[PDB]
A paper describes a structure:
Mutations and multiplications in the SNCA gene, encoding alpha-synuclein (aSyn), are associated with familial forms of Parkinson’s disease (PD). aSyn, an intrinsically disordered protein, has been a significant focus of neuroscience research not only due to its central role in PD and related synucleinopathies, but also because of its abundance and function in the nervous system. aSyn is primarily concentrated in the presynaptic terminals of neurons, but is also present in other cellular compartments including the nucleus, and is thought to interact with membranes adopting helical conformations and tetrameric structures. In pathological conditions, aSyn is thought to misfold and accumulate, forming pathological aggregates that disrupt cellular homeostasis, in a process that may ultimately cause neuronal cell death. A central pathological hallmark in PD and other synucleinopathies is the accumulation of aSyn into insoluble aggregates.
WES identified a novel heterozygous missense variant in SNCA (NM_000345.4, cDNA 174G>C; protein K58N). As previously reported, WT a-Syn fibrils adopted two similarly populated conformations, consisting of one (1PF) or two protofilaments (2PF) respectively. In contrast, K58N adopted almost exclusively 2PF conformations. An atomic model based on the 3D reconstruction of these fibrils at 3.7 Å global resolution revealed a similar protofilament fold as in WT fibrils. However, K58N fibrils present a higher twist (−1.29 degrees vs −0.81 degrees in WT fibrils), and a slightly shifted protofilament interface, possibly due to the proximity of the mutation site (K58) to the interface stabilizing residue (E57). Additionally, no density for residues 14–25 was visible at the periphery of mutant fibrils. The findings from cryo-EM data revealed that the K58N mutation preferentially results in 2PF fibrils with a similar protofilament fold than WT fibrils, suggesting that the mutation stabilizes the WT inter-protofilament interface. In WT, K58 may form a salt bridge in cis with E57, which could destabilize the inter-protofilament interface and thereby favour 1PF structures. In contrast, the K58N mutation may prevent this interaction due to the altered charge properties, thereby promoting trans interactions with K45 of an adjacent protofilament and thus favoring in 2PF fibrils. Altogether, these results indicate that the main effect of these mutations in fibril architecture is the modulation of the WT conformational landscape, favoring either 1PF (G14R) or 2PF (K58N) forms.
Residue numbers in the entry:
A (entry chain C), B (entry chain A): 36 to 97
Write the structure that this text describes.
């Protein structure tokens, strides 16, 4: 299928995932997987297959 | 006289005079004279003398 997408922007500043942490014991920032953060962010047919994306963190501290 | 001034800033972005103009016939931006636009902007005894600062524009179009 056609996905024509016309974005004419005068001016644009786009910020993706932001990680800010102050006065933290132990810090683990988890950013990854499938993230698209452009001015014209277009994503299609992501993992149309069997597999899938997974962004997971392994902090336990038992 | 004493003018102790203690400014401890975590983070600061300061913008001076801003000139934005779109679709203008004839443009004359006049920024000058005595302008101080720092993070810690301190001005004292400006033209304590006879003279004075003057920021003037000479547009007539008669």
């Amino acid at each position: 299928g056609v996905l024509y997408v016309g974005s004419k922007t005068k001016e644009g500043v786009v910020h993706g995932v932001a990680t800010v942490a102050e006065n933290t014991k132990e810090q683990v920032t988890n950013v990854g997987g499938a993230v698209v953060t452009g001015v014209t962010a277009v994503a299609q047919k992501t993992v149309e297959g069997a597999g899938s994306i997974a962004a997971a963190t392994g902090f336990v501290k038992k």
